[PDB]
Amino acid sequence: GGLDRGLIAVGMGLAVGLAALGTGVAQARIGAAGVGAIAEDRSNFGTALIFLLLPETLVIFGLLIAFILNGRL
Amino acid sequence: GGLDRGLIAVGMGLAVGLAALGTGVAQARIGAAGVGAIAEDRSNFGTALIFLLLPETLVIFGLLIAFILNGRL
Amino acid sequence: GGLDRGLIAVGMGLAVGLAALGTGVAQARIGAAGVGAIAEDRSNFGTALIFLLLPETLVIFGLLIAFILNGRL
Amino acid sequence: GGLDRGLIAVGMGLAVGLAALGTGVAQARIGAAGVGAIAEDRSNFGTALIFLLLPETLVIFGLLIAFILNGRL
Amino acid sequence: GGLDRGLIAVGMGLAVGLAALGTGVAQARIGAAGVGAIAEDRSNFGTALIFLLLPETLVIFGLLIAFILNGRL
Amino acid sequence: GGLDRGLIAVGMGLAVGLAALGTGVAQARIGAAGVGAIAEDRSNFGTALIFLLLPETLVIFGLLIAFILNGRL
Amino acid sequence: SGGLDRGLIAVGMGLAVGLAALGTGVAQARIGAAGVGAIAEDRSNFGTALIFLLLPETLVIFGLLIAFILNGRL
Amino acid sequence: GLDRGLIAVGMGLAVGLAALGTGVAQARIGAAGVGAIAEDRSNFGTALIFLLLPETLVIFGLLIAFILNGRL
Amino acid sequence: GGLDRGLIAVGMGLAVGLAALGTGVAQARIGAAGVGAIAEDRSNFGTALIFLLLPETLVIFGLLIAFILNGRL
């Protein structure tokens, strides 16, 4: 084990949090535009939710990075 | 007691905090635009509820990561 | 060594701090939008205030995980 | 002679500074909006004003964490 | 030893500086709004001065914890 | 020996997280404008999808860099 | 009381005073911009603008006094 | 060999900051470009060029990563 | 001398740099407004020059603190 487990812990933590904030600003702009549209059209819900769900795959990227490294420990 | 445990605690805390930051920066824009809509329409209120509730999975995901790191602790 | 608990303490402090600031960056924009909408509206302020008090559970999560990780001591 | 005390200091410093930053971020926008609302109305006075007083609980949280980690000393 | 006292100093300095920054930006926005309102009015100025001189709780709590840390000698 | 694997891993984490930040920052504005366009159009969804599929190559670069790093591990 | 502690408390001084100066500049930017925008056509109410712009300097003096006292620890 | 981890984190933040720079660049230019698209199908290809242009920055970052990998 | 001198140097540099950049952004906004005003006016140059002069007291503080923290020799 040793301290290197702590170092990989902080590494995955900062990776996933930084990805989370990127996804957050993405969802900010996307949700603003989406509600502005959906207040009138109420039919573009599918494409709006698709746009919203797109960066969450990028979050899953950090998920699998954390997964493989905690498998390594 | 071990030096690495402080590291893993720091990593967990920073991860969940940056996830919280992303959640907040999303919520700002999306809630502003949504309440701007609902103030005059008030009928798309459930749609606004769905829009605001959707991006919240990031922080519970981060705290699940924190939980499994405490399990490794 | 006993130096472990100081590091976990700084982890708690930083985590709850930036959770709070993400809360604030949400709250500023959404509160400004809501108070403008109610200065127009004067009646929808109940839903406005529940929108304001909605997202704050993130700092509760941060403080409770900090609590249990401190109680690990 | 443990070195953890300065770590305690820097941790509580990060916590309180981050809390202050977030609450001031809230206060700027909400105060400007309140200035507009009262300048146009003067009857939205206390209603706008309480929103300014809302984020202080975020400060007192991190204050409480700082105090308990100080009392651990 | 005694380097713990230097760690005390850096922690309190960063804390009070961050509180100073947040208060300063809040003052920036509220002051811009207030001076515009007064330049139009000149009769509503006292309330604007109040709004300017509200948020100093942050920095005074910063000095509070700072001198606590100093007295921890 | 030791003291290095955690360092290379935190390097991977910071690289991939920063790539995530940049990609999300791009996606925010470009997707919001594309949502506005497609809501006004309902016919230009292909080019909107084309513009959304642009940034992810940065995250791809980051993750392949992490892959070659933990391969050299 | 130590070898490196003097420089450590010194970087503490730097942190505090520099962040205070930055915050004061942040305030002064917006308030001075709005005030000069008004006094461009006003030419009379420079007094209220200056009494606005002077009051953030308390935020400076807090940081500088804290640095001064921790240096006076010496 | 702590130097390996050191140079690893170094190239990591180098390429990451390159990613941020190109991210903000593409953010602004693509945000303008999509609004242009609605009638600028004539200028569509040029919009592709201007969007593609800032990639030289991240390929410089990749070059730095590769030369660090060769050094190690 | 000693390493403590280098710590003194980095602290002094940090202080003066932060002061310089705060003065820079302050002067940026106020001088943009003043340049516009004097462009139309040509007569109120005293106000603009004194307004650009006033923030320089902060880097004057930086001057004096750097000098006194150099005076240890």
Place this chain on the structure above:
Amino acid sequence: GGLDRGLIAVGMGLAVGLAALGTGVAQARIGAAGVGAIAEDRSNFGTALIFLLLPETLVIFGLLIAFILNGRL
């Protein structure tokens, strides 16, 4: 002390990355200006191109100084 090369590398890497970020925001704004000019004119494209190819001399400075400091090794 073979650990010299590691901080050598991190210094040059952060240098070139930060220069890259500066060019990133520079080309962001100037490209927005260029396409805004394109929206009404055909002939100005080469002019806008030379404007946006102006600022890269700083990143070429960063990479060349990085190369020549690597030549010390």
Place this chain on the structure above:
Amino acid sequence: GGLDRGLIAVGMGLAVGLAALGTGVAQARIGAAGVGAIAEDRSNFGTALIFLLLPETLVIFGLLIAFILNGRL
């Protein structure tokens, strides 16, 4: 102890760079306003040159700090 010299080199570099960033962020808005005014006027360029040249004192202070630290070296 030449590591002291390395420390003072780091301090000098960070000082001059932060001052450079401050004068750049000043020059952004100052040059924007000035070039707009001189496009309007074409004759007021001397005042524009003065207002753009004013913030040089910050980098002057940084470089003289560097010079005196080398003189102590």
Place this chain on the structure above:
Amino acid sequence: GGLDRGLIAVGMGLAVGLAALGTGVAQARIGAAGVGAIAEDRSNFGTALIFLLLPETLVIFGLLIAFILNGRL
């Protein structure tokens, strides 16, 4: 030993990096404004040239700082 030149190289790199960043910050706004003027005008081109080429001072100073620190190396 090698730590000495490693620290000085770190200082060089960081300094030139944020000098470049400040240049990008200034250049983005000034170039946008100049292009906006010259697109309609196409006559003040030399004035546009001088306003764009003015801010090289900080990078040339940082280059000289890097050179003198390398001469110390």
Place this chain on the structure above:
Amino acid sequence: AKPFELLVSFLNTPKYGTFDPTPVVPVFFPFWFGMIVGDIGYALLFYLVGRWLSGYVKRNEPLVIDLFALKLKPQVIGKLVHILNWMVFWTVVWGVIYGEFFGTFLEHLGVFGTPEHPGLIPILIHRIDTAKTANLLILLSVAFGVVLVFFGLALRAYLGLKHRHMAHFWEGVGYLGGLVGVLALAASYLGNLQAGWLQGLMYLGFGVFLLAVLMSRIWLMIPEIFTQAGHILSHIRIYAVGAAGGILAGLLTDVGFALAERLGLLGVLLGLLVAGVLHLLILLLTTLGHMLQPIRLLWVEFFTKFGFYEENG
């Protein structure tokens, strides 16, 4: 006791049949300001300013503020002169127990006695002994707030009973139960525990809270109990502001004394000149800085705990 109601009058009236809230702030506000200031020298120059103001009073004609275009009060000006008298003797007595004002005059010789420095009058409180005593002083500050919170809840319960408005009375009872439970639990856990005595009373306070809540079942204001905890915690600023002011005054006197010593035989004149100039300007800033905090506290906490923003009379 009469004049302070004019200060209260700047805000709206309350509904008739309710409690007249005036008389508390005559005894409380100058108390709080005295706790803040301790700068008896400022009180002296302030008394000179009051002499000038009474010069206007005998010059009964009301001035207009040039910058703010404000016609004078003169009757209300005399009311001020009275409340200024109240706050000035409070300033005097608190500065007396804080006997060093302008700063700590005992540098060169024993102006005051300390356990460290011999002097004429053994003083009670310094700014160095507060390395230990600040904790106790902050505890006193907390007790000060809990006193007024208890007064406010008692009055609110009494008016709820009088109005036959029992719902608000019941909500106040819940506030009491929750407040005492969380207060005692926090005091035990943060400080010395002593679980053999107080655990029962914490459990009883929590049980009272939950019983009142369940009888008042309908979706009530547990977040507002959290806010009222914020309200009681908010009043801590009283110690910090005065501590900062005293620290600054001590710095100024240290500067003056060092200029008196290290600058030769002639350094006294310039040291006192610089100290006076800096002292007057920092007081010009910090007086208006400090004045509005206790009235803000009284306003927001007292009148939110009380609750009167309805029908405005």
